[PDB]
Design an enzyme around this catalytic site. Sequence first.
Site, PDB file in Angstrom:
ATOM      1  N   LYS A 152      -1.952  -2.881  -9.973  1.00  0.00           N
ATOM      2  CA  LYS A 152      -1.829  -1.644  -9.205  1.00  0.00           C
ATOM      3  C   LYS A 152      -3.137  -0.866  -9.319  1.00  0.00           C
ATOM      4  O   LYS A 152      -3.426  -0.268 -10.363  1.00  0.00           O
ATOM      5  CB  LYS A 152      -0.661  -0.811  -9.725  1.00  0.00           C
ATOM      6  CG  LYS A 152      -0.568   0.574  -9.105  1.00  0.00           C
ATOM      7  CD  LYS A 152       0.866   1.049  -8.977  1.00  0.00           C
ATOM      8  CE  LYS A 152       0.967   2.541  -9.296  1.00  0.00           C
ATOM      9  NZ  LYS A 152       2.154   2.901 -10.119  1.00  0.00           N
TER      10      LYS A 152
ATOM     11  N   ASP B   7      12.004   9.008  -9.343  1.00  0.00           N
ATOM     12  CA  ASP B   7      11.828   8.282  -8.094  1.00  0.00           C
ATOM     13  C   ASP B   7      12.709   7.037  -8.082  1.00  0.00           C
ATOM     14  O   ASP B   7      12.287   5.960  -7.648  1.00  0.00           O
ATOM     15  CB  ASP B   7      10.353   7.945  -7.874  1.00  0.00           C
ATOM     16  CG  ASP B   7      10.037   7.619  -6.437  1.00  0.00           C
ATOM     17  OD1 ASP B   7       8.976   6.992  -6.198  1.00  0.00           O
ATOM     18  OD2 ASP B   7      10.856   7.980  -5.554  1.00  0.00           O
TER      19      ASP B   7
ATOM     20  N   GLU C 288      -2.720   0.784  -4.177  1.00  0.00           N
ATOM     21  CA  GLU C 288      -2.390  -0.519  -3.626  1.00  0.00           C
ATOM     22  C   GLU C 288      -2.009  -1.441  -4.773  1.00  0.00           C
ATOM     23  O   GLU C 288      -2.491  -1.285  -5.900  1.00  0.00           O
ATOM     24  CB  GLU C 288      -3.550  -1.134  -2.827  1.00  0.00           C
ATOM     25  CG  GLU C 288      -4.167  -0.214  -1.790  1.00  0.00           C
ATOM     26  CD  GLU C 288      -5.024  -0.972  -0.797  1.00  0.00           C
ATOM     27  OE1 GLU C 288      -5.888  -1.780  -1.230  1.00  0.00           O
ATOM     28  OE2 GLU C 288      -4.838  -0.755   0.419  1.00  0.00           O
TER      29      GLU C 288
ATOM     30  N   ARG D  26       0.855  -1.175   0.000  1.00  0.00           N
ATOM     31  CA  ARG D  26       0.000   0.000   0.000  1.00  0.00           C
ATOM     32  C   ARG D  26       0.893   1.227   0.000  1.00  0.00           C
ATOM     33  O   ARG D  26       1.734   1.387   0.888  1.00  0.00           O
ATOM     34  CB  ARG D  26      -0.943   0.043   1.204  1.00  0.00           C
ATOM     35  CG  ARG D  26      -1.751   1.338   1.205  1.00  0.00           C
ATOM     36  CD  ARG D  26      -2.689   1.490   2.379  1.00  0.00           C
ATOM     37  NE  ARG D  26      -3.917   0.718   2.213  1.00  0.00           N
ATOM     38  CZ  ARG D  26      -4.765   0.458   3.208  1.00  0.00           C
ATOM     39  NH1 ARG D  26      -4.515   0.923   4.428  1.00  0.00           N
ATOM     40  NH2 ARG D  26      -5.859  -0.265   2.988  1.00  0.00           N
ATOM     41  N   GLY D  27       0.708   2.089  -0.994  1.00  0.00           N
ATOM     42  CA  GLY D  27       1.325   3.392  -0.998  1.00  0.00           C
ATOM     43  C   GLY D  27       0.302   4.482  -0.720  1.00  0.00           C
ATOM     44  O   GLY D  27      -0.888   4.247  -0.537  1.00  0.00           O
ATOM     45  N   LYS D  28       0.805   5.711  -0.694  1.00  0.00           N
ATOM     46  CA  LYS D  28      -0.076   6.859  -0.542  1.00  0.00           C
ATOM     47  C   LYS D  28      -1.048   6.980  -1.711  1.00  0.00           C
ATOM     48  O   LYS D  28      -2.166   7.482  -1.540  1.00  0.00           O
ATOM     49  CB  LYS D  28       0.770   8.125  -0.407  1.00  0.00           C
ATOM     50  CG  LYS D  28      -0.008   9.425  -0.263  1.00  0.00           C
ATOM     51  CD  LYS D  28       0.245  10.051   1.106  1.00  0.00           C
ATOM     52  CE  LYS D  28       0.167  11.573   1.050  1.00  0.00           C
ATOM     53  NZ  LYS D  28       0.485  12.178   2.381  1.00  0.00           N
ATOM     54  N   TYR D  29      -0.662   6.506  -2.896  1.00  0.00           N
ATOM     55  CA  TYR D  29      -1.444   6.739  -4.105  1.00  0.00           C
ATOM     56  C   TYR D  29      -2.061   5.481  -4.704  1.00  0.00           C
ATOM     57  O   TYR D  29      -2.832   5.594  -5.662  1.00  0.00           O
ATOM     58  CB  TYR D  29      -0.574   7.422  -5.169  1.00  0.00           C
ATOM     59  CG  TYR D  29      -0.100   8.804  -4.778  1.00  0.00           C
ATOM     60  CD1 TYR D  29       1.106   9.298  -5.251  1.00  0.00           C
ATOM     61  CD2 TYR D  29      -0.864   9.614  -3.942  1.00  0.00           C
ATOM     62  CE1 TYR D  29       1.551  10.558  -4.895  1.00  0.00           C
ATOM     63  CE2 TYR D  29      -0.432  10.879  -3.581  1.00  0.00           C
ATOM     64  CZ  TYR D  29       0.779  11.350  -4.065  1.00  0.00           C
ATOM     65  OH  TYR D  29       1.233  12.609  -3.722  1.00  0.00           O
TER      66      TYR D  29
END
Length: 328
Positions: free
Chosen positions: A66, A154, A50, A45-48
């Site tokens: 994603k 990134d 899953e 899970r990221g901020k933006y």
Amino acid sequence: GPVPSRARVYTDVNTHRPREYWDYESHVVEWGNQDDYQLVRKLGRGKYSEVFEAINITNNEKVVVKILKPVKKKKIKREIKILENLRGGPNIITLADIVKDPVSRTPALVFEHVNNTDFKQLYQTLTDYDIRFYMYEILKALDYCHSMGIMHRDVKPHNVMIDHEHRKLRLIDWGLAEFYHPGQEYNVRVASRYFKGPELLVDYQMYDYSLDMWSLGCMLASMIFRKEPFFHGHDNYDQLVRIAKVLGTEDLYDYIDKYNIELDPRFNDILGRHSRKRWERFVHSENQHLVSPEALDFLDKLLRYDHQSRLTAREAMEHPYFYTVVKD
Ligand SMILES: COc1ccc(/C=C2\S/C(=N\c3ccccc3)NC2=O)cc1O
């Protein structure tokens, strides 16, 4: 005001592309069939978003799904267009499909699956030769996306999926990536803290592909020296102080003086005066076997304050550090 800057390579790539290539806001998403994909287990899970491991039941193959959390349509299409532009390039993760998730009500990107070795076993066991090998594989991906008008923004270990069994590498998570346009001012709130370039930390917005090469240097330093992350700041300010204790404060001032940049006054109390250090200082008996004169010279030419003086991805691939790597 600040002095403008341009990339020294691939400067005009998007200019001479058709506007369709880079005008991602106008992109028309072509949707697959959501029922072809069966989720198996949540992987992150990221901020933006899953991310799930899944099965594509039309070929019984594993895929990675994603599912975006709600985000502006612009940024969803940016990632999608970039994935589509770069598909098939060396070591770029392959967008297999895009489907509408019925629960999330948002798009779900379907990727090729990488049987990744997770990153602490990789960090603990990669040899001198493996580090060189995988560095070269990463530079192939970066030279490709830079040559295609795109900066990743990134680069960090977690976005480099390696199936060490098959010596297979894939650069993932293009959700921060952007098109490079000469003269365009960008958001400096990109990359994870330990891999943020000096340009980001001094609030210089007219950066380019060379930001990825700084991040790649930070990764390289963490591997050959066995200190991950290498520049370990407690926040974005202390991040710049950690860099300046190694690269020195005199060249930091040269850098900002070249672009007529002014440091945030809050550095006045925390920056100090620091000489530039020789890289040998970080060598010891537990990382020795990973260090060579070639390694240090290559690292030295990536970790430059002036984004305009860093090696390009292609230049880096010419460096003697890679002479020992078997070419295919
Ligand atoms: C296990 O094999 C894979 C794993 C990941 C990807 C691609 C990803 S993962 C991502 N974003 C994240 C990452 C962590 C947490 C939340 C979201 N963006 C991508 O392109 C592709 C793979 O084959």
